[model samples]
Target chain A: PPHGELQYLGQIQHILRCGVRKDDRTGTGTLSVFGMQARYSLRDEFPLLTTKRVFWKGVLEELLWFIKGSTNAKELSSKGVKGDLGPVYGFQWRHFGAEYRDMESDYSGQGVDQLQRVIDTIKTNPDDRRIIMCAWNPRDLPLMALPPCHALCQFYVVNSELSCQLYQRSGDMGLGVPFNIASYALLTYMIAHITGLKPGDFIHTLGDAHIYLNHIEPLKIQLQREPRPFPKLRILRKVEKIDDFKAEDFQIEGYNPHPTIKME
Target chain B: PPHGELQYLGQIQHILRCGVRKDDRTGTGTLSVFGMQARYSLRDEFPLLTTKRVFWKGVLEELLWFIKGSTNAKELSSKGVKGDLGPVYGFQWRHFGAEYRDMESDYSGQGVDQLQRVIDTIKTNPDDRRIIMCAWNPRDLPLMALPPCHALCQFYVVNSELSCQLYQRSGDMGLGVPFNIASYALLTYMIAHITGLKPGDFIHTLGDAHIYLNHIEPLKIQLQREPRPFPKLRILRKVEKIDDFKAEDFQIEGYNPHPTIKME
Candidate 1:
């Protein structure tokens, strides 16, 4: 009976009270907890945090780009961000173990396509526990823009529902964690639709779950407000393949979050 | 101030009351919940579960063997286990991207020595967040004894103590385990010992945490009992190197517990 959004809010409050002061990769000092977990159900509605308006388009765009196996930092469904993002999430997910080259190079049949393999396993071999996708490639880490934050994810199936659990290495609790929640949930939704199953749950697990020192006050403001119900995502078509869906084919309904709270 | 063992016992009770029945790889049916986590402190004592006596010898030797970089699963392996486990925990830990031959092959300077790097990082750069070791290798899955169940673990350091978190894909939640629990806690203790830091906490996060259908009646009995205090582990030697550890070097004190029980 736990509502998903409150679970996220409770973590923010807990970190404020109990987290340790540690300097971070982004020299933005942090109040951090070592390991924490939150479960968001995707049964009747999605877990796009209703406390603040999450960027729906960016979440959708980045995931689709990652699925496309595109590693170019600038080539998302929008204006490219700058520079080589390196062999980050999308590259590792699709071509894990492949030798690295420039982002513009073609890796037609190189390493493992972990994302597709998971989808295939869910369809044919649901009981196999090895149906996992890891974004943390140790060999590729030195070449990455930054090490993968939302690192490994595993998929599960039971009674016509698909559930996912993600283990994130480092989280920017105020900013990045919220976006990751929506991204992975959207991932489960799309994969479930392709495999003809319902979305079960998205469990977010973290290491160094931190609130960047500067965002603590806005997060304190975030905790004071009451949570509204989470919105539902509806895929506009009966999409059969993972790569076939577009931005227009998805719709976000009834997402009336409170006015946006700013965080530096 | 909840007891750590009780946190474990509570999970058994929750599964019995709310788990969904499903078939498993062992051909044993299971009552499973998707994701669950438990944290056991290694600060003053080790978490050798007192609910039932867990195998201390197996846990210790296996960890020592893993740190020795032996890929032979037959090697930790007692009750001693058998055969080449392909590239399991140790091989991946020391030489991640190395080409894995048989157990007899030498991998002197192949891939990454993740464990050694972590120890170095802890001593010099305790603030770095990429101190992670993974057992799941996508390219090598078919070659594994069994794909890593306790897949990936990340270590964190704060206030002069080290904590580790494990993301496991499936757990039988059997009487035998809480063997996985003891194994990792000892691991944290050893690494903490090597790095000259106090052992902090071991957080176990699971994807499909389940009780074998046959385990129901016995676990129901397990829940009825009150937990005794956890035992303390004392390392008898100065142990300057990770490989310097031996079985006799460990002594478990104050371990008074109820008799062990079993199931098919």
Candidate 2:
């Protein structure tokens, strides 16, 4: 029960029991809980969900895309999405203070690179609480194809350890939540590695954490299964820069999980 | 264990047990933990900490200052501070897209009013995951007297219940946290009242949760004391909007708390 993935399972249980019926498109509705938080420790092991194998490759590519500050969805064709997604996560991260142009344009050194600033702050002023990145912009909401779900993430460093706390306004339990957990865990690991600090925790705070009505059965099956010991993630070589590390440079060991459960 | 205030006390306990020694000014230090989360349910009760009597009037007055979007420090003279504090909480909330001139200048319709927008969204689109307000801005950090510690907040509504989640980058666990809880709780209460919804939860997510070295004994005393049942907060009369709430218009009942302790 102390395992990080068990806490995710607990959220599923909590939603199943206490989640309210909140409606949407087909009127099928979602079992939604307003406020929920879970801690995923990256102490020695990664927090990729054990009950269901999360798509690590997908998580990796999307994060790399976000890190690269490519607002164009064509860059992250993992979902076959094309065209501009508009100043989303990547744009918000690398070019916060700058103006948005068409996705085809260049924004090199245009705005504040929060990722690099945060990394620099961690290396220089480790105890500084100002190391933060904001993805939720009130002004830019309408211009985007999709606004940020994982809205704002703050980085905290203490005792040569780095931790990340994500405030996600809306989380889809089955699909998005698992991927988000892995994505953030990897980001923190990379940051910590680059900053020469140990990875600590990826704390997730959700506002409208929900499971779809149709996802209940599959989620319950996933919940009934036990959590395996989380896998260890190690970088192959000393990557000096965050953007320099490719997906192939990271190695995961002992990532045996129960078969993946299908969810709508 | 279920009482919301107990979680605050538990954090005190946790810090005492597992917190690391981190140094600061004057060679003094803090017992710090990286990430912590606590939930204070606003269901028919407010989470004004029963361990120590949080300054209710101060909390109310400051929140009112935030609602008014006054960048001037003179308005919130509770701290004996004067002059421009710049665009801190209120300015960020009511004017998300505006340029700052100074505290003396007026910003009537200059920027996006997030508080009003969030309330309107709740009334119309209750299931929207986009209801959010950010206090942390990378561009405006240099312009402000104090950068926001409670960086961002996201609102969630379901089943006619309104809840808010705050992601505070750093929190002084003993002093700032209790006051912040009451402040957000009251803010949510007012918004819920105006939107014709019931209060759901006030969830606080913290990045660097720390107790000062000098605050250790006082917090220990706070931990030893049992949490009294949280008092219920009621609006005495109908509040038309978020900005219309007065300190006297609300009443608190059954608030029996331990005597206040001094902290450095």
Candidate 3:
């Protein structure tokens, strides 16, 4: 059976060979394809990319922050995570501003708690088709440092198994996609763990799946390395709620991979 | 070149063969598959499925209604369109309820006009990545008769051509998918027309692409029929805004299809 990480590599290669050269928001040109879909079955293995080293810790921390419902960049900074991490995922995941006015407005606690609702829905109504968590709050776009790339996700439960599908409008293939795949897979695992259901699959769907010109060579280098066995993700502690998870509690076992590709 | 209608047919066949038999909200069992994507180039042909007859007129009216930004079903009814078409497409397309309280609560004109913003963005900043129109307002889900299946859409512009990608959470492959393909393609055409750009592509991505148990026979019939040439859509007059077009203003030429399969 093919490793799930190969799907990511295939998409990168697809865009590089067949995608149209297009100008992007970053002014770094991209070989961009319009729509793509990739699937990772959680029952088989954790979809941490083995072709190159993935920053698994950063992915976990960012997910934990989103589950914590903290939109402020200072919250991430306080936890010793270094980066100018903008109000991107956590802000919209938790505090989706329904009554948004502008960027400078005081919207501290005035939005739908989408993550909470999603968790609640999983517990009560697992089979509901509307089990969706949307991060693309159109009203709060101006306030966001960067609009969400992996925007909306819907959860499905069938036969005591939870599956998640993400709708990402834009993807930075080389730099962001691997992290996104693992992050969402971890999220699915956590949610399923809390809800007492087995993890089924993580379906990653994209709109503009692009390879930035700067990262093309590095991605090509990464692609040359053969894929190793996928690591197993184990959550050490039993958490009552999704918010109670800590970065320390999660561990990735057997994630031996080729050296990291330095993305510009 | 394969006409884009085959993509729709292929999805139906795929779901029938590979999709899991799952229970759904409609009390109808479904052969459901997760995460499928299909593309149609509008420059080549308008993607009205010729394997089976499509309600092209209803597709246009619903789109125009959304562009008009009218939430009430009475607006569609007053236009001589008869159906219990609840707050489905147009309600979310034009007047998306940001501060939604409940279904009974007075939410008249309290939401953002996403259509207007999309039009404005196309005119002023075509390259903006946030030119998205979302129909899945979580707060207003209770009020809707049926929650949005074709949930969100993002428009992209490259080389003076306008393209659209739709993230549909759930799709009825036999009944709804063909119409959705045409509807969004028409929307892409109209947006391109108003913005003075050539129509590029209409990409439809689905979370749950399913064929209902009841529609299995009808879809099998549809599959047997050969796909004819896709029809050409013509806008009779130059419309300044998206809302300024009527049903008669649009024409579909050469749309000769097989007999209609009544979905029950």
Candidate 4:
């Protein structure tokens, strides 16, 4: 198991306070947090939350769906899974304009499918602009119950392996942070599994990543608990093809952490 | 009249494609877009759209509110103005609870004053970490009738002047892009006006900045009509304070374009 202690706790705490401030009634302000480039490798161990009952299954499913380049919520919901992240990557990819009479059946591409395409494009046509996969849709802006949370992501290939960089427009650290970490990492892993590439850095670019004021106390407690050793995330059967992966195709072994921290 | 042709029309077209993709019907997918940087110098000309009504007044008012660190849509609505970008920033900022409940407030310092505070923070305390204005609140996420488009932004002081970078989680290139370009540029200018700093760069980071699939042809037609020389944005003299500024305080000069193109 491999683990790295959080060095910038002060900054993280400031962001937490900022999140609370933005939510304050007396003051409705902007709480924007920027995430710099940080690298984490799955070569040593699997990144899973032992601090709580981490939704490893949801994480896997979500990642698989993203690589599927899918934007529809039906695939995940059909399996009784929900990220509740709002019109996130999947929403932007598929059903953006279902409400409009003109755009009813226009959306077809999936982020999951795009992921494979990007991987293949990077391998065969690195210079091709077609390798990009976007999640922001304008027509669906009016129809979306909630706009996408993390809006878009792009993949890059180096040395015959795939490296992914995801740009999240908004992030909820208390509620969405842990999942984001695991989710992007798993996304990289899954993409690598199918693309014949090894795991690479999951570059997470965040616009507003914050912890709710209500969740501050709980977050502090979780921070106090020691982060367990890294666990190995195993993708079932070492998927040879990206499209062949399913929710049951993955598992996490050797995760350790404190009890689940309750949050608002 | 100085003018520059659109640089990345094809890339813009590509982004819009992905934007629509993330909006699939099932809504299970999640992707985030971010970390965009661009510079618009006012010395040459103002950034405005001659092909469409850029809503220069709305953009300026919204910028002032953001500088004041305000996130209340009601306050904006009271002024007979609505950017539709507020709910994501304001609603989420104040009531980000399980069902939009009150937790705690982040602006406890009573320094809610606008431009001056932003000026002082940028100049005196560059790394104070308190110099943040946020719009994304978790409690308000569920209640928001419409989610925020450009969630939050951060301003940094470089060389004794204020430089701003806006991180919009989701951006619509058709309707929102023009405003985004002009609004943020004007924001940088206003902050520079208050802080005695020249506008440096307005970095527009988009998680999923895209045009609607339906909007492609219209955009192409608009693109065919060259983006005319930049227009001069006129701000009413009565508006000195950031919060005190109203929607009518700003105006656009020298914009010549065809009638508004309808989005299908």
- What i-RMS does each candidate reach, in Å? 3.3, 3.8, 3.6, 10.8
Task: Write one digit per residue (lDDT tens) for candidate 4, span A1-264.
Answer: 334424223445567654334432234343535443334555746656555557777777776675554546666667768732344555444344344232233445421333444556655654222234545544445543333333445565444545565655445666576687788778678767766777755555654455665666777776666666667887768656666777777667787666766666
From the highest TM-score down, the ranking of the candidates is: 1, 2, 3, 4
lDDT of 4 by residue, B28-59 (tens): 23221222334444543576666655655567
Candidate 1 per-residue lDDT over residues B63-167, each given as its tens digit: 778788887766666546324546767777787766887877778867777777778878887898877766755444665432433476788998998999877
Top candidate (lDDT): 1
The candidate with the higher DockQ, 2 or 4, is: 2
Each model's lDDT: 0.81, 0.79, 0.77, 0.53
TM-score of chain A of 2: 0.90
Give the runs in model 1 whose Cα sits over 4 Å from its true position: A77-84, A95-106, A109-111, A137-140, A143-150, B71-90, B95-111, B136-140, B143-150
Q: How well does candidate 2 reproduce the true complex, by DockQ?
A: 0.49
Count steric clashes of candidate 1. 4
- lDDT tens digits, residue span A141-248, model 3: 565433433477888888888999987778888778888889899999999888888889988888777888888888888878889999998889887677778779
Model 3 docking category: acceptable
Share of native interface contacts present in candidate 1? 0.69
Q: Which is better, 2 or 4, measured by lDDT? A: 2
User: lDDT tens digits, residues B51-116, model 2?
Assistant: 888788788778888898787767888564324546677687787677888876677768878678
Q: In model 2, where do residues sit more than 4 Å from their true spots?
A: A24-28, A71-88, A95-104, A136-140, A143-150, B24-28, B72-85, B100-105, B136-140, B143-150
Chain A of model 3 scored by TM-score: 0.88
